[PDB]
Enzyme design. Structure first.
Site, PDB file in Angstrom:
ATOM      1  N   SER A 159       0.800  -1.226   0.000  1.00  0.00           N
ATOM      2  CA  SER A 159       0.000   0.000   0.000  1.00  0.00           C
ATOM      3  C   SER A 159       0.835   1.279   0.000  1.00  0.00           C
ATOM      4  O   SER A 159       0.247   2.357  -0.041  1.00  0.00           O
ATOM      5  CB  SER A 159      -0.965   0.037   1.191  1.00  0.00           C
ATOM      6  OG  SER A 159      -1.989  -0.929   1.065  1.00  0.00           O
ATOM      7  N   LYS A 170       0.065   4.231  -2.389  1.00  0.00           N
ATOM      8  CA  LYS A 170      -1.083   5.117  -2.251  1.00  0.00           C
ATOM      9  C   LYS A 170      -0.651   6.550  -1.945  1.00  0.00           C
ATOM     10  O   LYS A 170      -1.385   7.491  -2.246  1.00  0.00           O
ATOM     11  CB  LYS A 170      -2.038   4.554  -1.196  1.00  0.00           C
ATOM     12  CG  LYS A 170      -2.627   3.194  -1.569  1.00  0.00           C
ATOM     13  CD  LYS A 170      -3.374   2.563  -0.406  1.00  0.00           C
ATOM     14  CE  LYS A 170      -3.853   1.177  -0.805  1.00  0.00           C
ATOM     15  NZ  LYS A 170      -4.529   0.465   0.312  1.00  0.00           N
ATOM     16  N   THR A 205       1.356  -3.522   3.664  1.00  0.00           N
ATOM     17  CA  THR A 205       1.414  -4.922   4.059  1.00  0.00           C
ATOM     18  C   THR A 205       1.119  -5.755   2.825  1.00  0.00           C
ATOM     19  O   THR A 205       0.146  -5.469   2.114  1.00  0.00           O
ATOM     20  CB  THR A 205       0.361  -5.236   5.119  1.00  0.00           C
ATOM     21  OG1 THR A 205       0.442  -4.282   6.194  1.00  0.00           O
ATOM     22  CG2 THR A 205       0.555  -6.609   5.682  1.00  0.00           C
TER      23      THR A 205
HETATM   24  C1  LIG Z   1      -1.756  -2.178   1.576  1.00  0.00           C
HETATM   25  O1  LIG Z   1      -0.653  -2.526   1.947  1.00  0.00           O
HETATM   26  C2  LIG Z   1      -2.928  -3.010   1.491  1.00  0.00           C
HETATM   27  C3  LIG Z   1      -2.994  -4.214   2.115  1.00  0.00           C
HETATM   28  N1  LIG Z   1      -3.836  -5.156   1.923  1.00  0.00           N
HETATM   29  C4  LIG Z   1      -3.924  -6.405   2.668  1.00  0.00           C
HETATM   30  C5  LIG Z   1      -3.595  -6.249   4.161  1.00  0.00           C
HETATM   31  O2  LIG Z   1      -4.137  -5.312   4.772  1.00  0.00           O
HETATM   32  O3  LIG Z   1      -2.784  -7.077   4.641  1.00  0.00           O
HETATM   33  C6  LIG Z   1      -5.213  -7.135   2.441  1.00  0.00           C
HETATM   34  C7  LIG Z   1      -6.420  -6.383   2.996  1.00  0.00           C
HETATM   35  C8  LIG Z   1      -5.073  -8.575   2.961  1.00  0.00           C
HETATM   36  N2  LIG Z   1      -6.101  -8.951   3.917  1.00  0.00           N
HETATM   37  C9  LIG Z   1      -6.043  -8.885   5.256  1.00  0.00           C
HETATM   38  C10 LIG Z   1      -7.258  -9.276   5.696  1.00  0.00           C
HETATM   39  N3  LIG Z   1      -7.965  -9.555   4.586  1.00  0.00           N
HETATM   40  C11 LIG Z   1      -9.348 -10.031   4.502  1.00  0.00           C
HETATM   41  N4  LIG Z   1      -7.281  -9.364   3.481  1.00  0.00           N
HETATM   42  S1  LIG Z   1      -5.450  -7.298   0.681  1.00  0.00           S
HETATM   43  O4  LIG Z   1      -5.684  -5.995   0.030  1.00  0.00           O
HETATM   44  O5  LIG Z   1      -4.314  -8.101   0.215  1.00  0.00           O
END
Ligand SMILES: *C(=O)/C=C/N[C@@H](C(=O)O)[C@](C)(Cn1cc[n+](C)n1)S(=O)O
EC number: 3.5.2.6
Length: 266
Positions: free
Chosen positions: A44, A47, A212
């Site tokens: 992320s 962003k 992440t």
């Molecule tokens: C920026 O780094 C976005 C991260 N996306 C991850 C995360 O927050 O670890 C997601 C949301 C993975 N995840 C965690 C819990 N869930 C249901 N999905 S995803 O967009 O990969």
């Protein structure tokens, strides 16, 4: 500093992790680094550059900050807290979506902005426009964060991203008003309390954007002001065998290693 390198390598060895770091001054000159030109998944962290692209379009007039972006439930993906709250109303403005993307890492809001700027190719064009030939966005959320080992899609390097951060905040990429707004968004970020800023002195002005990814990616990019000295910083880590809390602690530890360097370089 040699302590800087040695302390990072000790963390890498003991946590079975790789730590990419670059610290640059406001003009992009290197202060310190580790694995500075190794590619890491952005997760992320992109962003922040995305919001910068939006502010450039606002600055130029090709976008308007209060323009209403309509959407339906199809735009909700995992971790879209603001997008979910605004769904019934039927829109978020350009600025609301950008602020949600930066301060909450809202993934739906990120995809909504990508819809409006031309998708991943437009984000990559912006990197190139401001002199970053390395960072690349190939996909939207969530798949851009898959972080498949060895995949060069959706990557940057610590040094390229740190120099991009410096260009945005110190290098005149944005008007003074847009620069000040994005700075305040970064300071007010809601997702970084346990990462880099947890390892920095509490009188430093710090603003940052976390990331992440799957396969152990945990990142944090931004800026810090130590007294009168401004720095841009990019931290990318890969630690597949650590827990999420341990990865947070790892990035905070990197913040402390940075701090020891900066405090001693005085
Ligand atoms: C920026 O780094 C976005 C991260 N996306 C991850 C995360 O927050 O670890 C997601 C949301 C993975 N995840 C965690 C819990 N869930 C249901 N999905 S995803 O967009 O990969």
């Amino acid at each position: 500093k040699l302590t800087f390198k040695t302390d990072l390598e000790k963390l890498e060895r003991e946590k079975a992790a790789q730590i990419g770091v670059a610290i640059v001054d406001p003009q992009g000159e290197i202060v310190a680094g580790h694995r500075m030109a190794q590619r890491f998944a952005m997760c992320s962290t992109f962003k922040f550059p995305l919001a910068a692209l939006v502010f450039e379009r606002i600055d130029s007039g090709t976008e308007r900050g209060d323009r209403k972006l309509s959407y339906g439930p199809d735009m909700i993906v995992e971790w879209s807290p603001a997008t979910e709250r605004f769904l019934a109303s039927g829109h978020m403005t350009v600025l609301e979506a950008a602020q949600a993307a930066v301060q909450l890492s809202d993934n739906g809001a990120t995809n909504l902005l990508l819809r409006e700027i031309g998708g991943p190719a437009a984000m990559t064009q912006y990197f190139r426009k401001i002199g970053d030939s390395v960072s690349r966005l190939d996909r939207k959320e969530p798949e851009m964060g898959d972080n498949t080992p060895g995949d060069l899609r959706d990557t940057t390097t610590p040094i390229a991203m740190a120099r991009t951060v410096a260009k945005v905040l110190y290098g005149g990429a944005l008007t003074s008003t847009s620069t000040h707004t994005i700075e305040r968004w970064l300071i007010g970020n809601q997702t970084g309390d346990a990462t880099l800023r947890a390892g920095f002195p509490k009188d430093w002005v710090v603003g940052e954007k976390t990331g992440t990814c799957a396969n152990g990616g945990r990142n944090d990019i931004g800026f810090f002001k130590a007294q009168e000295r401004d720095y841009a910083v990019a931290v990318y880590t890969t630690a597949p065998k650590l827990s999420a809390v341990e990865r947070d602690e790892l990035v905070a530890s990197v913040g402390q290693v940075i701090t020891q360097l900066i405090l001693s370089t005085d």
